[PDB]
Amino acid sequence: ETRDELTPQMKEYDRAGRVWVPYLNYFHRPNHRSPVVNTDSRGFRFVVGKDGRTFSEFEREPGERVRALVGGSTVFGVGATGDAATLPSLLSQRGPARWLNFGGRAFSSTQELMLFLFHARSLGALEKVTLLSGVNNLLLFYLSRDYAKDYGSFFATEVRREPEIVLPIVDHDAQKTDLLHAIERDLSTWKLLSGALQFELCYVLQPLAGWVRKKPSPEETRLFADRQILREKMDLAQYAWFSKSLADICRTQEIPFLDMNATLSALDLDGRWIFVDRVHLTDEGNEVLTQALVEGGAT
Amino acid sequence: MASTTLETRDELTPQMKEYDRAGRVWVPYLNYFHRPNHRSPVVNTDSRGFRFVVGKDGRTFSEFEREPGERVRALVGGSTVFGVGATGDAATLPSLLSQRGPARWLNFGGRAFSSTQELMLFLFHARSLGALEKVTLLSGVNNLLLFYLSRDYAKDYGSFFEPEIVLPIVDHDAQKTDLLHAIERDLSTWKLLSGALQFELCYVLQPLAGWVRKKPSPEETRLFADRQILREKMDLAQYAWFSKSLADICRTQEIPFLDMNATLSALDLDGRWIFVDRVHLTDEGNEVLTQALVEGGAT
């Protein structure tokens, strides 16, 4: 099969496993061990710095400079061939400061914020939190049958089981705007935490294959050939609206904003193998993304 | 068959019928909140499930509505803040505090909430509230009660009403210090919010009938006659440990703390009808509590 042929590492992200967690609803199974992916006792992915030095369990020594990359599966590094090939590892291997992997597979913006609030007190002082996010809230909105504007939603809302707070959606395209509220509210909270914990904050719209203008590599073409939202609902008009909408939110709140889809389109990636699927990145993808992050002042 | 009479609950506390019917809905992340737009003589909730507050001159406040110049404070907690046991919205603590002035008080009581749910409810709605002068937390007991009802627990997250994050409890009494972590962690987030939103913060251990020294009223004697968790797990030894443990957390974080159980034991309430049940207050109880809160400097 193509996925096993070209991206064999994916069989291991299938086995990594999720567990139910109160409030968060889910996180990664802790203590997972494999050559591709390793998680510590709280479910956080290992980070690899220089010469194979591994960091986990919120370990922090004196004088260490620490930063946090927060997001979904792009931050976790689904599609990487190893812990060392993920963004936090690549960022740690370059810059002065080490980076924490606060990526949560399939997390919405609200789960990203909550994961940080649940553990912030164990991390020490952070210089910079970079948020690499956005796409999941758009995706899971269109995968939802019901939605609460004030709270948002998350993927496995099979968890839920006359007046209600979570209301049925009648027209996803006509009610789009409602999903922005959760992002704007979550960003406002990050802004509050930025000043209180004295870290710089940057919001980065994560890359989506259909939104990056790039002649695909032979590998990509074959991988994508194997659902109507990620298709029809996520067209370039959608990108136009979403990107603009998040840039407006961030500007109003004086949050540096960086749209990685536009950044990757401006680079010359024609024919380069960047994606293992429409959402996830290869090792080379992470290398390029990291380069663009550093370059864009988001690190 | 001999004629049937009203249950002691319906005869002495008929308003409890309305609290049974008021309703509870599922909400993501919070897991549950009050059914919105509920109408009854006893209890009313707005479009978000928050209870109505009655200010001076019988004026009702809801929907986070605010006028220019208003001084606003927030009472955050569980069913004691919500006002289960009251005969009307106007007999609840936020209403009693708003009538006294100088500020109007929001009812951020969530029925059955844990400390974590209380914090999340606030983080989900804070941006809509405007400036707050003081948040008063009236809480604690539920985290203890829910810990002893839980069969499983994740120390980093808590709980509410192949490896795992949520671990089974082997001995509640021996693992009971685990529940302090969630309280201390949430309080540190409150402490952080108090600085960023510039409001005063104060913690009040909510009353529990078994923890208040008071010769029972005749109503209370009938009502209490009818879960050992209340019988043996919440004994005076438990009260001693819990109260002292919360005092230590609050002193470390420089948060003013008030043990309402001790405050009420010191007053002359012998024979007075304070408790609708072991956890819920009468109207009279809310007046006593309000006076104690104001005199204690917790408002």
Side-chain angles (χ1 to χ4, degrees), chain A residues 2-3 24 37 44 48 58 69 75 137 154 165 167 173 178 202 206 210 218 241 260 264 274-275 282 288 294 296:
Chain A
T2 301
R3 206 173 78 121
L24 272 186
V37 56
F44 288 94
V48 190
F58 299 147
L69 189 64
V75 172
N137 287 61
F154 51 99
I165 296 183
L167 301 170
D173 288 343
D178 297 344
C202 180
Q206 67 174 87
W241 167 80
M260 277 294 317
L264 293 176
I274 297 304
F275 299 94
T282 61
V288 170
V294 166

Side-chain angles (χ1 to χ4, degrees), chain B residues 2 20 28 177 236 291:
Chain B
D20 293 333
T177 75
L236 303 186
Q291 189 65 257

Side-chain angles (χ1 to χ4, degrees), chain A residues 141-142 169-178:
Chain A
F141 177 83
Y142 276 89
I169 299 164
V170 291
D171 188 331
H172 281 98
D173 288 343
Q175 294 178 257
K176 270 146 73 189
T177 301
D178 297 344

Side-chain angles (χ1 to χ4, degrees), chain A residues 12-14 16-18 26 28 71-73 76 78 103-107 136:
Chain A
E12 184 61 70
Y13 290 104
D14 296 350
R18 278 170 203 56
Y26 52 80
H28 323 114
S73 300
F76 182 88
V78 180
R105 290 181 78 170
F107 272 8
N136 279 350

Side-chain angles (χ1 to χ4, degrees), chain A residues 19-25 29-30 42 108 110-111 114 117-119 121 150-154 157 159-160 162-166 184-185 188-189 192-193 196-197, chain B residues 25-31 33-36 48 114 116-117 120-121 123-125 127 156-160 162-166 184-185 188-189 192-193 196-197:
Chain A
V19 291
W20 179 90
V21 182
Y23 309 113
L24 272 186
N25 299 113
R29 190 173 296 280
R42 293 180 182 84
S108 67
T110 302
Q111 299 173 292
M114 286 173 73
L117 285 167
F118 278 120
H119 300 283
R121 182 163 172 272
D150 288 331
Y151 303 106
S153 190
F154 51 99
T157 316
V159 164
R160 154 172 202 200
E162 178 142 358
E164 305 277 317
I165 296 183
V166 192
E184 194 171 37
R185 191 272 321 292
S188 84
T189 305
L192 267 49
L193 290 152
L197 294 169
Chain B
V25 289
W26 186 84
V27 180
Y29 308 115
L30 279 192
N31 301 124
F33 200 45
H34 322 115
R35 180 162 314 264
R48 297 184 183 81
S114 65
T116 299
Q117 294 176 302
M120 293 177 56
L121 189 70
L123 289 165
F124 281 122
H125 297 284
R127 216 182 71 114
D156 287 333
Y157 302 99
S159 191
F160 51 88
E162 210 83 31
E164 296 281 335
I165 305 277
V166 180
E184 160 164 17
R185 194 271 321 298
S188 72
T189 304
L192 180 154
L193 286 169
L197 294 170

